[PDB]
Amino acid sequence: VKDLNLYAKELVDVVNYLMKKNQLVFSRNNKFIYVNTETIKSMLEKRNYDTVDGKLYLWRELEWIECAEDRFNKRIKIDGENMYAVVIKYSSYSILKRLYLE
Amino acid sequence: VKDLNLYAKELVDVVNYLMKKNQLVFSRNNKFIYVNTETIKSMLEKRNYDTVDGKLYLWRELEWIECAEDRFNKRIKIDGENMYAVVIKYSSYSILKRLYLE
């Protein structure tokens, strides 16, 4: 429950799940990974070591995700869509994946 | 596959110890905690789950500490005096402390 590896592992697994489902959306510069808020919320409900908001709060505080002020998502423009999404930093995912694989 | 909790708990414990001993200096905006490099290195020697540099390298890669180029510390100003210090991000310490409390 109070195990940082669970949060770090979940971030790498979220990207792995989206890769597998062919739902992975990258920014144009490949700096960010965009995920639909409802998709993230249904995925973060699976592992009961914390709530959805507890997971998002920790990712935000550790700066693995980019958020708007007092929110868990940002407003982004991608392939004609100008709306809210959970913004995962590609650099953070790469660092955590490299750590997950050592 | 490193146990991130060892590194995270050690960051929290180091700050707590130094807070208690009044050996911490905060930045004016409370964004950073400044610690003497030798004090940090002496404390990081105690727990043998990694080397001092292995611990500092992980804190730097996860961005829990702010460093100068190819250094584990940074040059700063304290009451007009310029000196090197390990610069801990207060936000990183807060989330980790909250994680191991609740």
Residue numbers in the entry:
A (entry chain A), B (entry chain B): 1 to 102
From the paper:
In the Gram-positive pathogenic bacterium Clostridium perfringens the conjugative tetracycline resistance plasmid pCW3 is representative of a large class of closely related toxin and antibiotic resistance plasmids. Our data suggest that its function is to decorate the origin of transfer of pCW3 and to interact specifically with sequences that are only present in this region of the plasmid.
Four identical TcpK molecules were present in the asymmetric unit, each comprising four α-helices and five β-strands. Macromolecular interface analysis of the crystal structure using PISA13 suggests that despite lacking the canonical MukF-like or MarR-like dimerization domain, TcpK is still predicted to form a dimer. The proposed dimer interface involves 48 residues for a total surface area of 866 Å2. These interactions are predominantly mediated through helices H1, H3 and H4. Surprisingly, the second helix of the dimer interface (helix H3), involving Y57, L58 and E61–W64, is predicted to be involved in DNA binding. Most notably, the canonical helix (H3) responsible for interacting with DNA in other wHTH superfamily members was buried at the dimer interface involving helices H1, H3 and H4’, and was hence inaccessible.
